[PDB]
């Protein structure tokens, strides 16, 4: 998707970051909106050790309490967001 690639680059450039868990269905749904374009999106893995385990120190210290959580322009957006919603949050056109 041209929108997905353009938006992903934009998120990378402004440091818009997704915090999630590789095994979390919502996180998987979020990545799937981007498809392969997700490769550019800054992503923090909060659960490298899997379900039920204490999350990554960086996630606890960032105050992550749900997956996915986006931090974009210092603003916090919890849960899955459409490409359109992420464009609006990040100031990416159309």
Curated annotation (Swiss-Prot):
Provide Periplasmic-side residue ranges: 1-94
Subcellular localization:
Membrane
Detail the disulphide connectivity of this chain as listed in its UniProt entry.
Answer: 24-27, 46-59
Cite the residue spans of the region called Thioredoxin-like domain.
1-94
Q: Where is this site: Important for the reduction of the redox-active Cys-130 and Cys-133?
A: 24, 27
Q: What does this protein do?
A: Thiol-disulfide oxidoreductase that catalyzes vitamin K-dependent disulfide bond formation in periplasmic target proteins.
User: Which family does the entry's similarity section mention?
Assistant: Belongs to the VKOR family.
According to the UniProt entry, the note on domains is: Cysteine residues from the thioredoxin-like domain participate in a series of disulfide-exchange reactions that regenerate the redox-active cysteine residues in the transmembrane domain.
| UniProt name for this protein | Vitamin K epoxide reductase homolog
Part of the whole protein covered: 186 to 279 of 283
């Amino acid at each position: 998707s041209p929108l997905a690639v353009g938006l992903a680059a934009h998120l990378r450039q402004i440091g818009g970051t997704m915090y999630g868990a590789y095994w979390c269905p919502h996180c998987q749904d979020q990545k799937e909106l981007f498809g392969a374009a997700f490769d550019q999106v800054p992503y923090v893995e909060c659960s490298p050790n899997g379900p039920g385990t204490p999350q990554a120190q960086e996630c606890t210290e960032a105050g992550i309490t749900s997956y996915p959580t986006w931090i974009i322009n210092g603003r916090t957006y919890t849960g899955v967001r459409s490409l359109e919603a992420l464009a609006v949050a990040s100031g990416y056109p159309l």
